[PDB]
Amino acid sequence: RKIQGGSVVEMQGDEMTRIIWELIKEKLILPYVELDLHSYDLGIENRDATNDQVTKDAAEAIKKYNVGVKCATITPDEKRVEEFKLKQMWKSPNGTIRNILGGTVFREAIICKNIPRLVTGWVKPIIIGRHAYGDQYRATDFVVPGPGKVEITYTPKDGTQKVTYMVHDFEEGGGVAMGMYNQDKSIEDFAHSSFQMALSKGWPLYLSTKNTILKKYDGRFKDIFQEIYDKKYKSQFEAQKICYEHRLIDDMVAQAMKSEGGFIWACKNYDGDVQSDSVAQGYGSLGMMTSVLICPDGKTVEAEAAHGTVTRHYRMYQKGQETSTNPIASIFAWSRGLAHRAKLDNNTELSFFAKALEDVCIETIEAGFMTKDLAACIKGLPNVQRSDYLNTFEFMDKLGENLKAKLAQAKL
Amino acid sequence: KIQGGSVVEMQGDEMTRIIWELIKEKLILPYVELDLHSYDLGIENRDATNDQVTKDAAEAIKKYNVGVKCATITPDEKRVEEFKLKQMWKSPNGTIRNILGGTVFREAIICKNIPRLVTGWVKPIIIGRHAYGDQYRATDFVVPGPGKVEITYTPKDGTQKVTYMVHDFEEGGGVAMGMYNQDKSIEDFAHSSFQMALSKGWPLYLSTKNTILKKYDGRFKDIFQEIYDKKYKSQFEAQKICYEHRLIDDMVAQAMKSEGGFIWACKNYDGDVQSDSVAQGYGSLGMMTSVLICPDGKTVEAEAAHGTVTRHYRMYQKGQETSTNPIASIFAWSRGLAHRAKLDNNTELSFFAKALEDVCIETIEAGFMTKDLAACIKGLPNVQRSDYLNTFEFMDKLGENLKAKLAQA
Ligand SMILES: NC(=O)c1ccc[n+]([C@@H]2O[C@H](COP(=O)([O-])OP(=O)(O)OC[C@H]3O[C@@H](n4cnc5c(N)ncnc54)[C@H](OP(=O)(O)O)[C@@H]3O)[C@@H](O)[C@H]2O)c1
Numbered sequence: 001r002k003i004q005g006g007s008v009v010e011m012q013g014d015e016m017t018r019i020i021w022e023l024i025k026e027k028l029i030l031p032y033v034e035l036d037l038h039s040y041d042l043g044i045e046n047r048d049a050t051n052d053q054v055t056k057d058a059a060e061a062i063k064k065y066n067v068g069v070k071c072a073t074i075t076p077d078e079k080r081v082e083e084f085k086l087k088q089m090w091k092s093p094n095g096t097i098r099n100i101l102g103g104t105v106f107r108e109a110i111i112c113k114n115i116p117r118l119v120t121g122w123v124k125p126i127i128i129g130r131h132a133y134g135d136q137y138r139a140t141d142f143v144v145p146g147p148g149k150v151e152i153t154y155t156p157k158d159g160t161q162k163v164t165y166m167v168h169d170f171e172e173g174g175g176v177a178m179g180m181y182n183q184d185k186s187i188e189d190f191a192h193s194s195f196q197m198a199l200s201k202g203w204p205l206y207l208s209t210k211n212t213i214l215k216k217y218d219g220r221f222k223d224i225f226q227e228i229y230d231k232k233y234k235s236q237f238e239a240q241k242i243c244y245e246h247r248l249i250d251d252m253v254a255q256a257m258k259s260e261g262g263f264i265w266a267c268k269n270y271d272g273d274v275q276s277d278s279v280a281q282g283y284g285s286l287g288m289m290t291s292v293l294i295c296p297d298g299k300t301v302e303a304e305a306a307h308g309t310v311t312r313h314y315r316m317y318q319k320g321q322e323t324s325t326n327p328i329a330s331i332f333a334w335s336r337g338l339a340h341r342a343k344l345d346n347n348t349e350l351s352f353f354a355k356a357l358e359d360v361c362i363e364t365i366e367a368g369f370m371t372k373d374l375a376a377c378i379k380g381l382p383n384v385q386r387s388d389y390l391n392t393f394e395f396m397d398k399l400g401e402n403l404k405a406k407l408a409q410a411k412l
Numbered sequence: 413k414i415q416g417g418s419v420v421e422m423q424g425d426e427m428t429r430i431i432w433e434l435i436k437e438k439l440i441l442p443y444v445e446l447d448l449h450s451y452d453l454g455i456e457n458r459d460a461t462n463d464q465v466t467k468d469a470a471e472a473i474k475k476y477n478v479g480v481k482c483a484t485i486t487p488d489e490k491r492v493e494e495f496k497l498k499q500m501w502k503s504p505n506g507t508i509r510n511i512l513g514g515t516v517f518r519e520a521i522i523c524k525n526i527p528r529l530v531t532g533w534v535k536p537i538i539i540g541r542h543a544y545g546d547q548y549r550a551t552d553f554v555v556p557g558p559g560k561v562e563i564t565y566t567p568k569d570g571t572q573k574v575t576y577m578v579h580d581f582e583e584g585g586g587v588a589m590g591m592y593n594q595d596k597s598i599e600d601f602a603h604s605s606f607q608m609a610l611s612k613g614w615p616l617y618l619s620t621k622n623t624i625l626k627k628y629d630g631r632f633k634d635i636f637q638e639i640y641d642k643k644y645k646s647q648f649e650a651q652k653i654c655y656e657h658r659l660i661d662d663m664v665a666q667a668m669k670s671e672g673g674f675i676w677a678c679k680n681y682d683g684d685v686q687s688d689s690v691a692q693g694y695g696s697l698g699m700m701t702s703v704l705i706c707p708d709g710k711t712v713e714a715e716a717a718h719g720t721v722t723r724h725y726r727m728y729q730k731g732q733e734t735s736t737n738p739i740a741s742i743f744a745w746s747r748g749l750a751h752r753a754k755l756d757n758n759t760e761l762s763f764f765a766k767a768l769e770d771v772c773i774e775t776i777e778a779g780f781m782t783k784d785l786a787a788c789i790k791g792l793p794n795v796q797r798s799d800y801l802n803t804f805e806f807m808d809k810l811g812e813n814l815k816a817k818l819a820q821a
């Protein structure tokens with residue numbers, strides 16, 4: 001009989017990842033695990049259909065059952081509005097889910113011994129702790145239509161002084177403007193998650209900001225981290241002989257590039273987004289990275305691929321060009337989500353299944369069966385033959401065969 | 413000595429200040445006579461003049477069209493205490509760029525014997541960094557407690573004011589900020605980017621986060637596309653190159669895995685961050701050029717992209733030997749003087765500028781380099797003192813080779 005897995009919130013997505021997502025459920029999950037699957041279609045059409053209510057409903061469900069596994073989703077701009085005949089330019093479902101749940105998105109490469117990196121020195125893992133709240137991802141932006149002043153105003157609840165700051169006086173023509181923000185409590189949760197992750201790994205921690213330029217905004221991050229360190233984690237850090245350091249983002253990305261890895265990197269929301277993809281590509285592929293939102297309650301997680309819907313491959317798929325999209329990141333959303341589900345329930349069999357799922361992925365790749373992106377890592381793109389890799393369906397089938405075999409052995 | 417002409421010089425801070433004088437003393441003035449308009453943008457003098465020296469320097473560049481700037485300290489609270497400053501002064505770079513406008517073009521300085529950290533970059537990556545607006549001319553503040561932050565637009569013509577909610581802080585405080593950009597600046601940004609692509613013969617990529625900042629970043633995307641479809645597309649096809657917008661996180665990955673050989677138009681912030689990422693990728697922050705090209709097509713400001721290298725300066729203060737790479741600071745002068753030459757049809761200064769650059773590359777390729785470059789070759793753990801020269805040892809070697817090169821031609 002199948003493993004009794006419990007309640008998991010599933011969020012279906014878009015385009016190429018939507019296709020892969022179904023193959024994963026059919027070939028790797030459902031045959032072995034029976035889940036109370038709370039499914040929410042976060043495909044762009046359904047979101048438009050529900051006026052994005054389905055996205056909010058999914059986030060609330062994650063609060064209830066403590067485990068979310070999410071497929072990559074289209075975040076629409078004008079072109080997407082035209083493409084799907086949308087009612088509105090809906091906000092990022094990820095931004096909405098993260099805004100509701102809070103926490104830190106931890107991202108890390110998935111490493112195979114036979115895959116060369118683009119960055120020579122990274123023999124140890126780099127873990128990015130991405131602050132999941134605020135800044136650009138909950139901003140209020142608009143087009144400035146012509147000459148006029150933009151100002152930003154603070155009005156305290158407590159009737160004290162109201163303050164108006166000049167943003168810019170557009171003397172001729174227009175442009176754009178935006179306001180963005182963050183909250184002390186969220187920054188504090190972010191700091192705590194960062195120090196704790198470093199202590200659990202036994203690695204140094206770095207925070208990057210641009211506090212020289214955003215003296216107040218980014219200065220707040222810097223101050224809160226330092227304060228929380230001096231009060232809560234300093235002695236613990238000293239005991240494990242690791243350090244915490246603040247660096248300017250400029251300096252930090254250069255430092256990361258030349259390091260050997262083996263550190264925790266606390267990033268502001270935007271930096272965490274951009275640099276996690278830089279790092280993932282650095283180790284080999286966007287297809288080879290885990291991403292898990294760890295919420296402040298220490299119980300709730302949302303696992304996801306860090307990459308998008310892989311539109312370009314999807315276009316190929318729509319035109320019958322054979323595709324070779326890497327499913328590993330999407331598979332690890334399931335394994336990481338199921339592993340947490342297992343941990344909460346002390347579900348030994350589910351834990352075993354989740355690790356076995358990950359082992360199958362690594363073993364299969366290390367045995368020389370891989371998608372084109374990984375084959376490109378080994379051979380270099382110009383040297384890649386069709387014989388060097390498997391197409392998307394072939395690779396999924398190969399994983400399914402290897403998983404079946406591995407789970408069959410273990411039972412014997 | 414060569415008669416250079418009028419150049420605006422800006423002195424800086426810490427390690428780069430030292431190097432800056434070494435450069436002038438050995439590599440420039442011994443060969444070039446300059447109408448040198450010097451401004452001390454050191455932290456001490458900026459404080460002394462209430463940062464007026466920085467604005468004066470900017471106006472000077474506009475007048476004489478050539479500026480060469482040394483790296484400067486941008487003060488935060490720690491700098492305020494360290495130097496007992498009157499105020500937390502704004503970045504002199506931000507101030508200068510805000511006045512001059514333009515695009516900061518950044519690119520690695522390549523030596524054949526220096527291994528990269530990124531295996532695939534056999535061709536160069538040129539970043540065009542929009543030098544105006546966004547985070548670098550923003551208004552930020554601490555939110556002291558519960559309350560609402562709103563952003564408002566008041567039309568100049570007296571029509572209806574518009575107010576947007578930024579955030580209602582219901583519990584505790586936080587931070588907030590407003591930032592902006594201008595259509596004309598974005599347009600100049602676009603033009604400078606397409607033109608650079610065409611002059612280099614390479615494809616052009618613009619990165620934004622327009623899926624998230626739909627209005628703000630969408631404007632950048634729309635302005636680039638419009639200008640492309642109307643002035644540069646035909647030329648692009650004719651050179652068999654192309655323009656493409658990408659989301660920033662896609663772009664950084666694409667860049668990481670590419671062979672190089674493209675122009676990368678970045679918003680101010682991305683240009684800042686990714687230029688350091690790329691410089692380090694090719695080998696060293698010390699090995700990158702940075703040139704602000706102003707929208708008038710005649711004014712230029714050259715600089716090092718890296719900072720004042722405070723950590724090396726700290727060792728220097730404690731008497732320890734330092735090995736800081738001067739090449740970027742040297743190229744600030746060479747790029748500045750080279751532009752000065754093009755302006756004045758000065759064929760003898762153009763030669764000197766090129767000669768200064770060739771001497772740097774020749775010397776490094778001959779096995780004489782600072783510790784950072786030696787670490788590229790051997791690996792940091794395997795570097796020994798015999799593998800490199802200290803800052804002053806290296807500057808002297810450059811001094812000799814320069815003179816010989818000039819003599820021979
Ligand atoms: N977490 C999320 O829900 C999320 C995150 C990012 C983007 N998105 C959305 O996804 C859509 C497409 O965005 P995008 O094209 O900028 O980024 P993307 O979907 O991540 O893909 C961009 C490029 O990255 C490479 N790539 C990403 N995942 C890959 C994989 N699994 N296997 C092999 N290669 C992979 C491919 O490179 P090559 O083309 O060179 O082969 C692909 O064309 C957009 O609508 C965006 O809003 C969603």
Ligand SMILES: NC(=O)c1ccc[n+]([C@@H]2O[C@H](COP(=O)([O-])OP(=O)(O)OC[C@H]3O[C@@H](n4cnc5c(N)ncnc54)[C@H](OP(=O)(O)O)[C@@H]3O)[C@@H](O)[C@H]2O)c1
Nearest residue numbers: 248251483484485486697698718719720721722723736737
């Ligand atoms: N253009 C500018 O005026 C500008 C730009 C950036 C920063 N800054 C200012 O500079 C100060 C220090 O900033 P920061 O320490 O974050 O950055 P930084 O001075 O650029 O460099 C920090 C690290 O980068 C490496 N590095 C940079 N330039 C180098 C060179 N020429 N040769 C060898 N190594 C080099 C060193 O690495 P290792 O320690 O590993 O040896 C150094 O410790 C700050 O006050 C900042 O405001 C100014």
